[PDB]
Amino acid sequence: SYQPTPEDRFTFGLWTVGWQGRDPFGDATRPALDPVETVQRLAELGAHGVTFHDDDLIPFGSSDTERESHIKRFRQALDATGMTVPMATTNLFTHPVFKDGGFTANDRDVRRYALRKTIRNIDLAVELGAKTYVAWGGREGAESGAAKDVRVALDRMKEAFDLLGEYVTSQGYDIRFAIEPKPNEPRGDILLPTVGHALAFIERLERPELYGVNPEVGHEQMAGLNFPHGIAQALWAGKLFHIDLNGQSGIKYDQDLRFGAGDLRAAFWLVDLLESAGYEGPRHFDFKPPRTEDIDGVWASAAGCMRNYLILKERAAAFRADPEVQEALRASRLDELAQPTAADGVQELLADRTAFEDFDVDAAAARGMAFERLDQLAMDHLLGAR
Amino acid sequence: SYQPTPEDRFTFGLWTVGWQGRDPFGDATRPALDPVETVQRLAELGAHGVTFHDDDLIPFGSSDTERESHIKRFRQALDATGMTVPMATTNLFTHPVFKDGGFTANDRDVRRYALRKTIRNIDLAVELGAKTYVAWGGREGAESGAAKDVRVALDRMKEAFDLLGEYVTSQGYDIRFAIEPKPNEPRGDILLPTVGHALAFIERLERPELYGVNPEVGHEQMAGLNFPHGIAQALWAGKLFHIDLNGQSGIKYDQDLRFGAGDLRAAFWLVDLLESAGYEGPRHFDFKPPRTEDIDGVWASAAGCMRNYLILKERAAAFRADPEVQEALRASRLDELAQPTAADGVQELLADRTAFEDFDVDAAAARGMAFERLDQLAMDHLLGAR
Amino acid sequence: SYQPTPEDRFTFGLWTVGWQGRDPFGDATRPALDPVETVQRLAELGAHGVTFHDDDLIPFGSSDTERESHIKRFRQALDATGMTVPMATTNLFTHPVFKDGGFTANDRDVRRYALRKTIRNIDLAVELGAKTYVAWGGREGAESGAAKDVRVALDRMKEAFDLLGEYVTSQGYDIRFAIEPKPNEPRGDILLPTVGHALAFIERLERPELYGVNPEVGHEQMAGLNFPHGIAQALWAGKLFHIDLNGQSGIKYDQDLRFGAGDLRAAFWLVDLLESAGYEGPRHFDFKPPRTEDIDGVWASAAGCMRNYLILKERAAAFRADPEVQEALRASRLDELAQPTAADGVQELLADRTAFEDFDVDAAAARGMAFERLDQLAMDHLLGAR
Amino acid sequence: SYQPTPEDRFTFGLWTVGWQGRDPFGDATRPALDPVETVQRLAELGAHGVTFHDDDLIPFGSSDTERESHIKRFRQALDATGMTVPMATTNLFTHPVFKDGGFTANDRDVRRYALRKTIRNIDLAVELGAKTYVAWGGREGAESGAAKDVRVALDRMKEAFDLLGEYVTSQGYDIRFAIEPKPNEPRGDILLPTVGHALAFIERLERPELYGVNPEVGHEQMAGLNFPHGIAQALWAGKLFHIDLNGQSGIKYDQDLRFGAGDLRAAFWLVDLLESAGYEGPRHFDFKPPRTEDIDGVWASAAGCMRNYLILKERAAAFRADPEVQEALRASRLDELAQPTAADGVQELLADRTAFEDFDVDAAAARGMAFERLDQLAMDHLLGAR
Ligand SMILES: OC[C@@H](O)[C@H](O)[C@@H](O)CO
Ligand SMILES: OC[C@@H](O)[C@H](O)[C@@H](O)CO
Ligand SMILES: OC[C@@H](O)[C@H](O)[C@@H](O)CO
Ligand SMILES: OC[C@@H](O)[C@H](O)[C@@H](O)CO
Ligand SMILES: [Mn+2]
Ligand SMILES: [Mn+2]
Ligand SMILES: [Mn+2]
Ligand SMILES: [Mn+2]
Ligand SMILES: [Mn+2]
Ligand SMILES: [Mn+2]
Ligand SMILES: [Mn+2]
Ligand SMILES: [Mn+2]
Ligand code: NA
Ligand code: NA
Ligand code: NA
Ligand code: NA
Ligand code: NA
Ligand code: NA
Ligand code: NA
Ligand code: NA
Ligand SMILES: [O-]
Ligand SMILES: [O-]
Ligand SMILES: [O-]
Ligand SMILES: [O-]
């Protein structure tokens, strides 16, 4: 039961299962993993594909020869297993040069370097098949107020994404960008801190059609936000180009628990939403097996990501299929929410005494929403207590 | 010192100083205030104007005669004092009819009523001089996941704001809308929870030019966000149509402390930003004198809002004017942040070996940002310890 | 399935199901409930008993005649249904007199009044059978720093609880006190903000044996804390005299969702802990049916509290009973956690080279904890996916 | 102005200014510092002393010869400068062996090793003059619910601290322990998450007099708590043995900003409290110069810690000394808070009709607390706007 297969589109970053366990207070607890080993183990577990930062696949500073060798062995593992690479990204955060940012570093020379580093890896991503190129500007931001003029930083951010769009347009590449918001960590505050801020920013780019969001469960939860609601807004905008799935236990450091852990009910509502919306993209896990775990625990945690998605998918489908739930949704007027408020237009509305002058507010107010019965059906379905 | 005058554009809602002190666990501690008294007392304190919800100025359910009488006495007080009304709004949250929303209530008849209630008060706002009409959808949202289909709710929200835009266009009115985000409270999660989400939503409206944001200090802080940064993004987008100033002591219920209270350093950076950007709009306080206070404390707290803005304005101007700060900003490369990254374009950048092949990442990395010295100059200026 | 009966010890406050729906931004959505109706409806749903504040049972300011009448009808309903009253409490928060506190109000006369109000209701609680008397000092605290000298306030708090202990000792009463922490709301910060602070405070009382804690799920979660962990510390201390069960969706205003809602996994671990510890006390729900609901939704939400406890109880028992889980617990060394570290004493430990000089830290470090496999068994059990 | 001298008791951990800048997403931005260099630079800046973890002073795994050499050079630097060592601690968090804890690791052999590692460094701390030995159990806790039985973990924690107390008693050493709470990070939840939990735990130790707390500004703020209030409770309990001073920008990862940064008003109220209470202990900064900074920024940030304490000390003293503030405190009944509520005892209170029967609750309720005027005097003093 709940056995993943490539059909399910589950993907993982090299840096997820490959996390060695270093944290702000801790040295590594596991050895580095060869990307080839990761491709093989994930294929065996039923994954569809793998994603990478440039510097996860090719060690930073590699010579051209060394680079080509790391790429070759990775391609052979992908080719052997049938694993895909639907997304890739750039590491614009680890190297000390990026301490004040990549695209919004105060030093101009750093901004230019960030763009070149990105462009090099776009070319590689395209060859390997990626259709989405993620950008997580984890160093874009500040710890103090005068360090970063945010209006000017947004000018630089826009400039950078507009040039990237000019580059992929001039190359004829198919690939789209997905901007990943995060509220904080490793900067005190990160620019584009939520899905909304990223969506808004995209609308000022030259070619907005080339850009969407890559929201992450835990990131929105680091602002105490409702991740399903934010995904709904991204879907409403036509901008859910990719997603990062994991768990997070509230407002704290980015934990990257396996998917299903953390806010379990939010995981359920997320799966419900992705499945009813027909999201087509990868089901990508950006998670970290806790550093308590050895390599066997790494693979158990990765398998758990997929298993939990599949359990939740089953529960959400059962919920929506249940005639008792379909009736409860009507009792709660979810059908009526879909009716246009005033298709009849402004003049009709203004002349309609049933909308104001003769509207019985007390009788409307007295009508319960029946949301608790509805939500207890959802609870019962999630828990298998039906 | 720090004496406000109408020149300073300070405004207050009737519901701010007029808050009787009811809270989730508490009955009123102060009597209702006559709006006439409020206009007179605020004028005496140096305010520029006053704002209102419909139902603050005219009791809900008033007959047409009663309505006209409340409006008349208010207009006479405004006229006597020279107090202005730069903004008004609708109460779509208190009456039980709005328990599931106004514009996104599941019941269609409620949605229509919300629109009529709004339109009636738009007409009054325009007569009284308001150039901004705020919409805070405090009941739009949910406590449970199936209660609200957020994509469909956003359809209804858009429909509602688009009709309002059609109405003010057809009337020839000058007035613009300002959508006020809030993450939660009184709903478990509110739709459009942050500045970013509101900015993004506006870009899908039919006439986006008619809509901006009304961010509130405490609201963004209820998501742990950096309010100055969010204001910078709103300014960058050209959408800071109005602002609500107050204080908030972290991630908790909406406190509505007087401005300057709560996160004092964020208040400083906010004033610094508004003043350097040349924000033109009202300096509106959406605050509540704590229910510990009697009426004398109400006016003291309102005076404190204005005093703190003026102190911070002085400190921020001194900071920016200090040659030592101008030098520290250069040391931190804030000047260089304003240089275009690659005005020279994509082909130049790609051919520039100083951007990649020959870029000395270690020498760049070793260059400190000098942000701590800069921030300690800012601290010294805020504290008057210069 | 999952049908509660009085054997299950579920209790509810009059003020829970009886909440009329007033919130900081909203008028009542439901009529007041007669306490007699509440006793009858809860009995029908399978509850064991009911709790009250003084002013929920007898309207504030009632004459002695009126008081006696409200008590009489309540006692007859209890007697008719076999409903019990295991706990009662005082309302030291609603009336404006308590705006700065009850026991720690700055005004001495208010402190004395708070004590008299409490003592009167202790006598009534004892007659009705309560064995625990809760004290939630919701007004004890501050919005500003100089308003409350916390050391002195703690002196007053101790004085007050010590006198209450002298009173119940002199009366020979059996009843114990349970102090309820909360971090904030309705004060900006509340004194004794968490389980730990309350536990610590109790240890400075004259008769600490008379006092324990009444932790509430949502309250600890308003500080982002792990409620099961805090309950474990209270149990470890022998101080879990009562508990308030509900749900909370993160760090925000006190939501009082039905139990099971909010952090579902924390609800599971809480039930697991209460059941393995053999907690004997009432399973008390301090929750609010959302104001979206009519009276039928009130009773559905109350029934859902009990149903969710019973589902979780079944899942937790299945988890602990599963041989595969018992093996995983051994694999994770939960058995070894129960072995004394050094029963052998200090000199042995210091002479034991296997503890230091000859301890192979790398071989120990390499041993994974197997916590992910364990936690996925727990997930599978919770979801019924076993 | 605001020049620190050793008289001011400012101290710093080796690991503070010596932080190389590694974060969860970042490699080091600065070279390791020689502890000798740190002692000399801090002495030049006006510090009083320095603190250390074992493994900051002596690299982990050093031979006995190497150990003795690192100690010798450190002692000579201390002796040359007159720098003191008032506190030391053990690193029970970095090495992978501690991935599930030190004293509460599930593996018994790890628990024993943790104790031996601690005892070795207690002996060194005592020789160097430390009067407080801090214990921050950063690895004690869990990411998942069944991984850690918290009641049993608390048994192990108590066992460990009781043995340490037996050891220092048997050695005749003068030194006391200070337990440092933290809510999370690097564990998902840490045991003893707040000041209150630590205070409560101490009261179950065999020799409670040997143990106090070492609260850290940012740690309590990671739970959204009021740090001054928690310090007041620790002082009330007689348990403020040491303190860690820094800044934190709300509920997020542990930032370790310089003192004064983050919540500036809380820093003011903290200094006000420490100075009025006559806290005698070190003014210890547990902070990290941001990794944006080079070594010159490191020393600027350290100097800023001390400068901000001294500015705030001046402002708080001016506030308390101001006759206008002394009058406002009376207007707010802070004097009356210090009067015993009922020194007259229970029978008097019960017979006193002015406390209940004849208490005019409405006249008391109507009396404003005047807290806003008081708090605006505090604001004016902090800002130097008096
Ligand atoms: O918080 C870290 C981020 O989630 C990244 O892993 C991005 O997804 C890719 O750089
Ligand atoms: O949280 C309440 C909101 O701040 C409102 O006061 C809006 O500004 C106006 O309806
Ligand atoms: O936040 C409100 C509290 O939870 C109360 O309901 C107490 O439990 C009883 O006064
Ligand atoms: O969060 C890290 C802690 O603050 C430590 O630095 C302790 O103070 C000493 O181990
Ligand atoms: Mn993450
Ligand atoms: Mn991610
Ligand atoms: Mn507000
Ligand atoms: Mn507002
Ligand atoms: Mn509650
Ligand atoms: Mn409660
Ligand atoms: Mn810290
Ligand atoms: Mn510390
Ligand atoms: Na490789
Ligand atoms: Na573009
Ligand atoms: Na009026
Ligand atoms: Na429009
Ligand atoms: Na009654
Ligand atoms: Na006592
Ligand atoms: Na050394
Ligand atoms: Na002991
Ligand atoms: O992540
Ligand atoms: O507000
Ligand atoms: O509650
Ligand atoms: O720290």
Coordinates of C-alpha atoms in Angstrom, one line a residue, chain D residues 87-325:
Chain D
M87 CA 31.9 31.8 34.0
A88 CA 32.6 28.8 31.9
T89 CA 30.6 26.0 30.3
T90 CA 30.8 22.7 28.4
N91 CA 30.2 22.1 24.8
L92 CA 27.6 19.3 24.8
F93 CA 26.2 20.1 21.4
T94 CA 28.7 20.3 18.5
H95 CA 30.2 16.9 18.3
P96 CA 28.0 14.3 16.5
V97 CA 28.1 12.1 19.6
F98 CA 25.7 14.6 21.2
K99 CA 23.2 14.4 18.3
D100 CA 20.4 13.2 20.7
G101 CA 21.7 15.0 23.8
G102 CA 24.3 15.0 26.4
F103 CA 22.7 14.4 29.8
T104 CA 19.5 13.1 28.2
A105 CA 20.8 11.2 25.2
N106 CA 19.0 8.0 24.8
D107 CA 22.3 6.1 24.7
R108 CA 23.5 5.6 28.3
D109 CA 27.2 5.6 27.4
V110 CA 26.8 9.1 25.9
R111 CA 25.1 10.4 29.1
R112 CA 28.1 9.2 31.1
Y113 CA 30.6 10.7 28.6
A114 CA 28.7 14.0 28.8
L115 CA 29.1 14.0 32.6
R116 CA 32.8 13.2 32.4
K117 CA 33.4 16.0 29.9
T118 CA 31.6 18.4 32.1
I119 CA 33.4 17.4 35.3
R120 CA 36.8 17.8 33.6
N121 CA 35.9 21.4 32.6
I122 CA 34.4 22.3 36.0
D123 CA 37.8 21.6 37.5
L124 CA 39.4 24.0 35.0
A125 CA 36.7 26.6 35.4
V126 CA 37.3 26.7 39.2
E127 CA 41.1 27.1 38.7
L128 CA 40.5 30.1 36.4
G129 CA 38.2 31.7 38.8
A130 CA 34.7 31.0 37.5
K131 CA 32.0 31.3 40.1
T132 CA 29.2 30.2 37.7
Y133 CA 29.2 27.1 35.5
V134 CA 26.6 27.4 32.7
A135 CA 24.8 24.4 31.3
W136 CA 22.9 24.9 28.0
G137 CA 21.4 21.6 27.1
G138 CA 20.9 22.5 23.4
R139 CA 20.7 18.9 22.2
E140 CA 18.2 17.8 24.9
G141 CA 14.9 17.4 23.2
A142 CA 13.4 16.0 20.0
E143 CA 12.1 16.5 16.5
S144 CA 9.4 13.8 16.9
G145 CA 7.1 12.7 19.7
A146 CA 8.1 9.1 20.5
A147 CA 11.9 9.8 20.2
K148 CA 12.0 11.3 23.7
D149 CA 10.0 10.3 26.7
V150 CA 10.2 13.6 28.5
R151 CA 9.3 12.4 32.0
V152 CA 12.2 9.9 31.7
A153 CA 14.5 12.5 30.1
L154 CA 13.8 14.8 33.1
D155 CA 14.7 11.9 35.4
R156 CA 18.0 11.7 33.6
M157 CA 18.5 15.4 33.6
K158 CA 17.9 15.6 37.3
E159 CA 20.3 12.6 37.9
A160 CA 23.0 14.4 35.9
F161 CA 22.7 17.7 37.7
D162 CA 22.4 16.0 41.1
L163 CA 25.7 14.1 40.5
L164 CA 27.4 17.4 39.4
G165 CA 26.2 18.9 42.7
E166 CA 27.6 15.9 44.6
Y167 CA 30.9 16.3 42.8
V168 CA 31.3 20.1 43.5
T169 CA 30.2 19.5 47.1
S170 CA 32.7 16.7 47.7
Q171 CA 35.5 18.9 46.2
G172 CA 34.6 21.9 48.3
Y173 CA 34.3 24.0 45.2
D174 CA 32.3 27.5 45.6
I175 CA 31.0 27.4 42.1
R176 CA 27.2 27.3 41.3
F177 CA 25.4 26.1 38.2
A178 CA 23.3 28.2 35.9
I179 CA 20.9 26.3 33.6
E180 CA 20.2 28.1 30.3
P181 CA 16.7 27.6 28.8
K182 CA 16.0 27.8 25.1
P183 CA 12.8 26.9 23.4
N184 CA 14.2 25.3 20.2
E185 CA 17.2 25.2 17.9
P186 CA 19.1 23.0 17.3
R187 CA 16.4 20.6 18.5
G188 CA 12.8 20.9 17.3
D189 CA 11.9 21.5 20.9
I190 CA 14.4 21.8 23.7
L191 CA 13.7 20.5 27.2
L192 CA 13.5 23.3 29.8
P193 CA 12.3 25.7 27.0
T194 CA 11.9 28.9 29.1
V195 CA 13.1 30.5 32.3
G196 CA 10.0 29.2 34.1
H197 CA 10.6 25.6 33.1
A198 CA 14.2 25.8 34.3
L199 CA 13.3 27.5 37.6
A200 CA 10.7 24.7 38.2
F201 CA 13.1 21.9 37.4
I202 CA 15.7 23.3 39.8
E203 CA 13.2 23.0 42.7
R204 CA 13.3 19.1 42.2
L205 CA 17.0 18.8 42.4
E206 CA 18.6 17.4 45.6
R207 CA 20.5 20.6 46.4
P208 CA 18.5 23.4 44.8
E209 CA 20.7 26.1 46.3
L210 CA 23.5 25.2 43.9
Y211 CA 21.5 25.9 40.8
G212 CA 20.1 29.0 39.2
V213 CA 19.3 30.2 35.7
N214 CA 21.3 31.8 32.9
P215 CA 18.5 33.4 30.8
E216 CA 19.3 34.8 27.4
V217 CA 17.4 37.8 25.9
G218 CA 16.9 36.2 22.5
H219 CA 16.0 32.7 23.8
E220 CA 12.9 33.9 25.7
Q221 CA 12.0 36.1 22.7
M222 CA 12.0 32.9 20.5
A223 CA 8.9 32.0 22.5
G224 CA 7.5 35.6 22.2
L225 CA 7.9 36.1 25.9
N226 CA 8.7 39.3 27.8
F227 CA 12.4 39.0 28.8
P228 CA 12.2 41.6 31.6
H229 CA 9.3 39.8 33.1
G230 CA 11.1 36.5 33.1
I231 CA 14.1 38.1 34.6
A232 CA 11.9 39.6 37.3
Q233 CA 10.6 36.1 38.1
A234 CA 14.1 34.8 38.3
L235 CA 15.1 37.6 40.6
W236 CA 12.0 37.1 42.7
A237 CA 13.1 33.5 43.1
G238 CA 16.7 34.4 44.0
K239 CA 18.0 32.5 41.0
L240 CA 19.5 35.1 38.6
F241 CA 23.0 33.6 38.8
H242 CA 24.2 34.9 35.4
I243 CA 22.6 36.4 32.3
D244 CA 23.3 36.4 28.5
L245 CA 22.7 39.7 26.8
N246 CA 22.0 40.1 23.1
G247 CA 19.3 41.0 20.6
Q248 CA 16.7 39.2 18.7
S249 CA 14.2 40.4 16.0
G250 CA 11.2 38.4 17.0
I251 CA 10.1 34.8 16.7
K252 CA 12.7 33.1 14.4
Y253 CA 16.0 31.4 14.5
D254 CA 18.4 32.5 17.2
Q255 CA 20.0 35.6 15.8
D256 CA 22.4 36.7 18.6
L257 CA 22.4 40.3 17.5
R258 CA 24.5 42.7 19.6
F259 CA 22.8 43.9 22.8
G260 CA 20.4 46.8 22.1
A261 CA 19.5 45.5 18.7
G262 CA 16.3 43.6 18.2
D263 CA 13.7 44.7 20.8
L264 CA 15.2 48.0 22.0
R265 CA 12.4 48.8 24.4
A266 CA 12.9 45.4 26.1
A267 CA 16.6 46.1 26.4
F268 CA 15.7 49.4 28.1
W269 CA 13.3 47.7 30.6
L270 CA 15.9 44.9 31.2
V271 CA 18.6 47.4 32.1
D272 CA 16.1 49.3 34.3
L273 CA 15.3 46.1 36.1
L274 CA 18.9 44.8 36.5
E275 CA 20.0 48.2 37.9
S276 CA 17.1 48.7 40.3
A277 CA 17.5 45.1 41.6
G278 CA 21.2 45.5 42.2
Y279 CA 22.1 42.5 40.0
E280 CA 25.7 41.8 40.9
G281 CA 26.7 39.3 38.3
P282 CA 28.6 39.7 35.0
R283 CA 27.0 41.6 32.1
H284 CA 27.7 38.8 29.7
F285 CA 27.2 39.1 25.9
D286 CA 26.3 35.9 24.1
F287 CA 26.1 37.4 20.7
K288 CA 27.5 36.9 17.1
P289 CA 28.9 39.7 15.0
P290 CA 26.9 39.2 11.8
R291 CA 28.9 37.2 9.2
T292 CA 28.7 40.2 6.9
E293 CA 31.4 41.7 9.1
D294 CA 35.2 41.5 8.9
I295 CA 37.3 41.5 12.0
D296 CA 37.0 45.3 12.4
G297 CA 33.2 44.9 12.4
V298 CA 33.6 42.1 15.0
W299 CA 35.2 44.6 17.4
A300 CA 32.8 47.4 16.5
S301 CA 29.8 45.1 17.3
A302 CA 31.3 44.0 20.6
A303 CA 31.9 47.6 21.5
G304 CA 28.3 48.4 20.6
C305 CA 27.1 45.8 23.1
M306 CA 28.7 47.6 25.9
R307 CA 27.9 51.1 24.6
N308 CA 24.2 50.3 24.4
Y309 CA 24.1 48.9 27.9
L310 CA 25.7 52.1 29.2
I311 CA 23.3 54.4 27.2
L312 CA 20.3 52.4 28.5
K313 CA 21.7 52.5 32.0
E314 CA 21.9 56.3 31.8
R315 CA 18.4 56.6 30.4
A316 CA 16.8 54.2 32.9
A317 CA 18.5 56.0 35.8
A318 CA 17.2 59.4 34.4
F319 CA 13.7 58.0 34.1
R320 CA 13.6 56.7 37.6
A321 CA 15.2 59.9 39.0
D322 CA 12.8 62.2 37.3
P323 CA 10.3 63.8 39.7
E324 CA 7.7 63.8 37.0
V325 CA 8.1 60.0 36.6

